Amino acid sequence: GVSAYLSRPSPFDLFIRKSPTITCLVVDTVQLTWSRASGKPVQHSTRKEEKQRNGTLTVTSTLPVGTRDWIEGETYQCRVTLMRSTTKTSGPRAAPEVYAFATPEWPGSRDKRTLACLIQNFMPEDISVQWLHNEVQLPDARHSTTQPRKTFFVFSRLEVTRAEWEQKDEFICRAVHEAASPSQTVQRAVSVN
Amino acid sequence: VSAYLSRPSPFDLFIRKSPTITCLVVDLAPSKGTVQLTWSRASGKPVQHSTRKEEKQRNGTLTVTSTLPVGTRDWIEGETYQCRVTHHLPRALMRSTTKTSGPRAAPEVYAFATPEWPGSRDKRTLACLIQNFMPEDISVQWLHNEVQLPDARHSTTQPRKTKGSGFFVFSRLEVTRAEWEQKDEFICRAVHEAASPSQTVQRAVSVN
Amino acid sequence: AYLSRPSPFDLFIRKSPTITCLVVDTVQLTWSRASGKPVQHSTRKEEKQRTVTSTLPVGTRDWIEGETYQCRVTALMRSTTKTSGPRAAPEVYAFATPEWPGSRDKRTLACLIQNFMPEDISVQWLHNEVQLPDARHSTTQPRKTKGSGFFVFSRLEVTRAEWEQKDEFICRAVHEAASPSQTVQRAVSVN
Amino acid sequence: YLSRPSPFDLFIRKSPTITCLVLTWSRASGKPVQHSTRKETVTSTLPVGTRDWIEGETYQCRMRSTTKTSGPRAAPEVYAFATPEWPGSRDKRTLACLIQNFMPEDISVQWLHNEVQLPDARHSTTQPRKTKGSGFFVFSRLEVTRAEWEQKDEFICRAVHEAASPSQTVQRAVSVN
Amino acid sequence: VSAYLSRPSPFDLFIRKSPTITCLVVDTVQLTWSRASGKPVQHSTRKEEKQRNGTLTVTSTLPVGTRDWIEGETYQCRVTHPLPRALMRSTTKTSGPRAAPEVYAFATPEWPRDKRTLACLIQNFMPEDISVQWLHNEVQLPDARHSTTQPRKTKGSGFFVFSRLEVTRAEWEQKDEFICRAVHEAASPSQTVQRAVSVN
Amino acid sequence: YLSRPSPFDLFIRKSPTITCLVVLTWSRGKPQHSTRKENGTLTVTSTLPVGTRDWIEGETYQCRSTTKTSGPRAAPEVYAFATPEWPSRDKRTLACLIQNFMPEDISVQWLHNEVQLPDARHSTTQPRKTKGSGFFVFSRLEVTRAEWEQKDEFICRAVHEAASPSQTVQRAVSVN
Numbered sequence A: 001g002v003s004a005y006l007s008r009p010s011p012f013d014l015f016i017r018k019s020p021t022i023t024c025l026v027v028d029t030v031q032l033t034w035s036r037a038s039g040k041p042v043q044h045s046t047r048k049e050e051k052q053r054n055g056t057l058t059v060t061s062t063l064p065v066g067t068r069d070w071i072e073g074e075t076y077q078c079r080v081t082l083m084r085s086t087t088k089t090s091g092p093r094a095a096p097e098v099y100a101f102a103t104p105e106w107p108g109s110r111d112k113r114t115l116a117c118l119i120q121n122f123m124p125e126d127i128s129v130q131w132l133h134n135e136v137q138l139p140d141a142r143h144s145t146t147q148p149r150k151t152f153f154v155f156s157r158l159e160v161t162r163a164e165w166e167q168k169d170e171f172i173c174r175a176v177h178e179a180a181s182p183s184q185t186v187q188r189a190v191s192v193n
Numbered sequence B: 001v002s003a004y005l006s007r008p009s010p011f012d013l014f015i016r017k018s019p020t021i022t023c024l025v026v027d028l029a030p031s032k033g034t035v036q037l038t039w040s041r042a043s044g045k046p047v048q049h050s051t052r053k054e055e056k057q058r059n060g061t062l063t064v065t066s067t068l069p070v071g072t073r074d075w076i077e078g079e080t081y082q083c084r085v086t087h088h089l090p091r092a093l094m095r096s097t098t099k100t101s102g103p104r105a106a107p108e109v110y111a112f113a114t115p116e117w118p119g120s121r122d123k124r125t126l127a128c129l130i131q132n133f134m135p136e137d138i139s140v141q142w143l144h145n146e147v148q149l150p151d152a153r154h155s156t157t158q159p160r161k162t163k164g165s166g167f168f169v170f171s172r173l174e175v176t177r178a179e180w181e182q183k184d185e186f187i188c189r190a191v192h193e194a195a196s197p198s199q200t201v202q203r204a205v206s207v208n
Numbered sequence C: 001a002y003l004s005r006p007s008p009f010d011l012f013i014r015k016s017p018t019i020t021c022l023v024v025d026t027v028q029l030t031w032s033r034a035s036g037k038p039v040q041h042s043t044r045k046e047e048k049q050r051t052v053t054s055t056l057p058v059g060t061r062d063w064i065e066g067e068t069y070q071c072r073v074t075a076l077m078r079s080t081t082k083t084s085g086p087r088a089a090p091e092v093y094a095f096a097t098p099e100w101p102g103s104r105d106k107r108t109l110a111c112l113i114q115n116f117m118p119e120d121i122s123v124q125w126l127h128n129e130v131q132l133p134d135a136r137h138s139t140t141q142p143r144k145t146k147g148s149g150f151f152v153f154s155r156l157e158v159t160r161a162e163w164e165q166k167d168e169f170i171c172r173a174v175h176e177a178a179s180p181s182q183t184v185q186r187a188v189s190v191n
Numbered sequence D: 001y002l003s004r005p006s007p008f009d010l011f012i013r014k015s016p017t018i019t020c021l022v023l024t025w026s027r028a029s030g031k032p033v034q035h036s037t038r039k040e041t042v043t044s045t046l047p048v049g050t051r052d053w054i055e056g057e058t059y060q061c062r063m064r065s066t067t068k069t070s071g072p073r074a075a076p077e078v079y080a081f082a083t084p085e086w087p088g089s090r091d092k093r094t095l096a097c098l099i100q101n102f103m104p105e106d107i108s109v110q111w112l113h114n115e116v117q118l119p120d121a122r123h124s125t126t127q128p129r130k131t132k133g134s135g136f137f138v139f140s141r142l143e144v145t146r147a148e149w150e151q152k153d154e155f156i157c158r159a160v161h162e163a164a165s166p167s168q169t170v171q172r173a174v175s176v177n
Numbered sequence E: 001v002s003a004y005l006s007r008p009s010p011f012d013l014f015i016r017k018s019p020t021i022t023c024l025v026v027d028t029v030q031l032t033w034s035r036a037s038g039k040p041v042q043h044s045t046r047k048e049e050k051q052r053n054g055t056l057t058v059t060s061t062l063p064v065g066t067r068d069w070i071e072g073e074t075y076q077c078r079v080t081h082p083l084p085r086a087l088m089r090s091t092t093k094t095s096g097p098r099a100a101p102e103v104y105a106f107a108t109p110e111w112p113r114d115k116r117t118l119a120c121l122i123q124n125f126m127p128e129d130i131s132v133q134w135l136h137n138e139v140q141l142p143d144a145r146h147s148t149t150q151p152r153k154t155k156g157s158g159f160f161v162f163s164r165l166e167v168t169r170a171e172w173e174q175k176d177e178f179i180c181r182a183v184h185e186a187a188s189p190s191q192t193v194q195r196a197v198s199v200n
Numbered sequence F: 001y002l003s004r005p006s007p008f009d010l011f012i013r014k015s016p017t018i019t020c021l022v023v024l025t026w027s028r029g030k031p032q033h034s035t036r037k038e039n040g041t042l043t044v045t046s047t048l049p050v051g052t053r054d055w056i057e058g059e060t061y062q063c064r065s066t067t068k069t070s071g072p073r074a075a076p077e078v079y080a081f082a083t084p085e086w087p088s089r090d091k092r093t094l095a096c097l098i099q100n101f102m103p104e105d106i107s108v109q110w111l112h113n114e115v116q117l118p119d120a121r122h123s124t125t126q127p128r129k130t131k132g133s134g135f136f137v138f139s140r141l142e143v144t145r146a147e148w149e150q151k152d153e154f155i156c157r158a159v160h161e162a163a164s165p166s167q168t169v170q171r172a173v174s175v176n
């Protein structure tokens, strides 16, 4: 009934911002407790609480973790009152392949165009996908990325309006991956016309 | 013990003309007895014979599925089908499924081909964006020489709702040089109840 | 001519019972009590159709203790009083329809209220701890069960914006045999 | 008074009748009326043609007239419920049926058990009342015994309506447990 | 070169109970029928016609099963000629919600005598497939006596057509009742709805 | 393809245009400025204004070839109709029948309180041939209670080159 998940830091937050966070998610007052397997101190975590439209209550705790602490292999635990653990992914690494496409205009969509990005063949599954226009990152809510499925690959989708591509007809799909070289960034550009 | 009940795939419903629903029982720990999967219709009208299937998983968990043929007119005109799971366990489990309601919108199909990737010049990936369809049920096949490729050859994402109403899926197909040099045409075809005239929309993509 | 009893809602919840004399054809509706004790002022409404109605406030204690009120129309004579006999509290059952094709933002809630005696019954629907307007629902007039009780059905169309705000709707029957505050209720949720 | 055929007589029995309740019968098209059955309140029941009624034939009794209701059509939605066990009544259960959003208002409701139609007096159905939008609704109530549901725990509420498809019937089953 | 594949008329499907579909090629062409289910297909009737504009018209009329069509079967027509690639046309039962047609019939006033015009508005039906017949003295008039507009989508979801029937005074003096009748899969219960109209 | 000016533009507006559709140069020839507008197949349209008198004089324009069609003339007959109140009292469908006009070029408008309603308010069929001489068109207009309470009169108007006196024929219909 009451599910619990614990995610790893975003690759964009972990390698670029150097501000990694892990998130413990509880899906139906429950209490969440952070703890480290080493015993070292956990930082103060932010806790959020939101009632969903299906009557579900969702509790999310976001814990800041040390960048070196995460890469050194620390194991963090989330205790709900069921306990979850998260640690870095081991295993082989591989850079991602990025391809960006632009749809032709649908018979109706004369002033809106859809951009798609395929990122595939990367290891492990942890990846961040971003869309940029004029070197400024777009709001995350404007694009929708699938979770990685084993061949790992993700698809990203971004609808752009006529005002944007007429301002500049160039949109960058950027993948931030642990195995991406040389700046943990592999990106592609695409144009509407 | 968890139980799920699917709807017919648009392919089975509109192309194969053999729609089926599947009651999937995932038993976190197999016990001793034989779980009972009983089919019924909310109208009280008869159901057909179902196929039962049991398979123990590598995590020591038992999986029991029952597949029921449903009448094409019956399903389309809004019949509700019911899977009753008697296991042991405390109370009986009851799942039901019916056609999804709401506005209808045909899918838009866009088929792309990734340019050649260094380190593998015999592989090309084909991507298909299918979007702006309502409701969410959709089937995707990839055709070569007007013949349908096996389903395991392609992956399709689960439908997601767009900015407005409407859904989208991506379909990915890895092809080989032997296949595109034999003929450089590949059909991404989407099967959806709202497509006209025969519930299919398709687009041709070429590797070059 | 018809002469109704106070609704259990007005009598027990609002604590302001009234009775209504309806004549289906000026006329003279002289209100009186069988005891000869005074009656209050009444309202009067005459409506030409393609009928004269008059509503009299009555005392709560006066009604509960068995006073008989009379509507003489001039000659038509109708009287009303507290029904007497066996009392039985109402059974309350509330149901939600499943989602019907072509309208996923609408659900109908149904309430069966049965096996109560006497037949005087009121039904309220509550959502978000507060009473929905009476016009939101319809309720059948009491019909005799197979045994000696009565039953009504109450129907309430609800919207997705309401059950996503709070997925709980209460069907509340007001009846004199309900212990101890003259109400029985049952909650129904859409999912 | 002059009634229209019940949807059960019209579409299930296929012998529809109209009754003039207080007598000569006539059709607006001038065609003859069948043999009338007079019964002494005095009523006259006239058999009508099924195709004739559906085609909008106007029958008159004397003067009162009747014809099938015009306007839009809509199939009924059916939902069947069973009440939980009530304390002190372990061997009784009440079944309820909500039939709604149909147009026009003429509708026939039956309850079946083992595909055997229970007698009319076993149940009570309200008269059609208007919904909040367009369309009508009725409620049907059926008390059932322990012996009935222990023999087969399935009861069918069936609605007969002109606009229902394919055979002018929509039904729902309900079980006690 | 273009090809068209029609659905059965509601009249053939529901009144005649002999539904057929037509494959119409316009400019020696070959036409092949099949079913998406793979089930066999009956024998087709082939007809060619020379037109005034010098273009040939080849038609293939295929009888289809009544229960097969109603169950949602898909039928296919394939055309081949000297054209680059084969033309594929497919047809099946129309989907979506169903609504019976609403029929209303008008009689026009006399224009500034020997002839009067009757109009029939049939609207708010789904899907778009509809047949319109005119009756007089309980017998159907020849189809050539009237003309029916092609279905156009109304403001809501439904469709409408108009049907126009010229009548002579010798006809309404014999009897002054003319029946406009729509055949439609959603009409109940016998797939027909009708309205009578008089000149006076 | 090459289209002729609509009777509305020719008579009501007095600024006729022709459109060349390619699924491009204009010639008469005597002496106007052109306007161009851009399934997988691109469709291009170019709209050229023409002099009113010139098209009346029988001038032949080319992109194929178009000109004022010669032939017999016949004015349109107009009948306006209102459906009965449906069992939806805030909406009424209005119908109009235009018939027996030659040639087939015709324009149909609905007017309310002397203002032409937007074209998308009504749905008008293509000119179909009748049994005798002339064509016919049907026009359908859904109206609302707010419209007829302000003025319960709706004009169905046909613009046709053979209509007299001023190329218009109209009939008024009321809801109540």
Ligand SMILES: *[C@@H]1O[C@H](CO)[C@@H](O[C@@H]2O[C@H](CO)[C@@H](O[C@@H]3O[C@H](CO[C@H]4O[C@H](CO[C@H]5O[C@H](CO)[C@@H](O)[C@H](O)[C@@H]5O)[C@@H](O)[C@H](O[C@H]5O[C@H](CO)[C@@H](O)[C@H](O)[C@@H]5O)[C@@H]4O)[C@@H](O)[C@H](O[C@H]4O[C@H](CO)[C@@H](O)[C@H](O)[C@@H]4O)[C@@H]3O)[C@H](O)[C@H]2NC(C)=O)[C@H](O)[C@H]1NC(C)=O
Pocket (backbone or CB within 6 Å): A003, A005, A007, A008, A009, A010, A011, A025, A027, A028, A052, A053, A054, A056, A058, A125, A126, A127, A128, A144, A145, A146, A147, A148
């Ligand atoms: C009532 O409604 C509520 C909704 O209001 C619903 O609650 C949902 O419940 C489901 C299931 O219980 C939840 O789904 C789970 O969510 C887990 C957390 O998801 C977050 O984290 C994901 C992991 O992030 C890491 O990995 C990614 C990928 O590399 C990386 O980018 C990150 O930086 C990080 O490293 C993340 O992928 C995910 O983001 C995707 O999805 C969200 C949509 O939720 C979207 O906004 C994003 O843009 C992106 O597309 C998200 O940020 C998740 O880990 C978990 O996934 C595992 O399990 C599923 C099986 O369920 C597997 O299929 C999957 O492959 C993974 O193994 C799972 O998906 C969901 O989060 C709840 N929603 C909310 C808002 O709380 C209730 O269930 C409803 N009740 C009922 C009865 O139905």
Ligand SMILES: *[C@@H]1O[C@H](CO)[C@@H](O[C@@H]2O[C@H](CO)[C@@H](O[C@@H]3O[C@H](CO[C@H]4O[C@H](CO)[C@@H](O)[C@H](O)[C@@H]4O)[C@@H](O)[C@H](O[C@H]4O[C@H](CO)[C@@H](O)[C@H](O)[C@@H]4O)[C@@H]3O)[C@H](O)[C@H]2NC(C)=O)[C@H](O)[C@H]1NC(C)=O
Pocket (backbone or CB within 6 Å): B002, B004, B005, B006, B007, B022, B024, B026, B028, B057, B058, B059, B061, B063
């Ligand atoms: C031991 O190992 C076995 C084998 O993997 C695991 O069994 C799996 O359990 C999961 C979770 O119970 C099952 O996932 C569910 O599958 C349902 C069926 O989906 C199939 O069919 C549909 C259409 O017919 C396809 O689209 C799909 O790809 C599958 O082929 C889904 O309907 C379920 O989704 C619904 O429920 C979930 C949970 O609430 C929601 O998140 C979804 O959004 C949706 O509402 C669900 O995905 C899986 O099918 C099982 N596989 C097998 C082979 O049995 C055991 O779980 C595992 N044991 C342990 C303890 O880990």
Ligand SMILES: *[C@@H]1O[C@H](CO)[C@@H](O[C@@H]2O[C@H](CO)[C@@H](O[C@@H]3O[C@H](CO[C@H]4O[C@H](CO)[C@@H](O)[C@H](O)[C@@H]4O)[C@@H](O)[C@H](O[C@H]4O[C@H](CO)[C@@H](O)[C@H](O)[C@@H]4O)[C@@H]3O)[C@H](O)[C@H]2NC(C)=O)[C@H](O)[C@H]1NC(C)=O
Pocket (backbone or CB within 6 Å): E004, E006, E024, E026, E027, E051, E052, E053, E055, E057
């Ligand atoms: C030389 O002259 C001949 C004789 O007229 C022409 O043949 C016609 O060609 C046109 C196409 O150019 C055909 O038009 C199409 O007809 C299809 C068949 O319709 C049947 O069913 C309808 C009822 O729904 C009947 O009214 C009709 O008579 C037929 O029985 C229609 O399905 C088509 O309409 C739909 O599709 C098109 C798609 O482009 C849309 O534009 C339409 O609006 C509509 O959505 C279409 O109308 C016509 O049927 C042919 N008639 C005959 C007798 O053969 C030649 O075209 C002509 N050649 C040249 C070069 O001019």
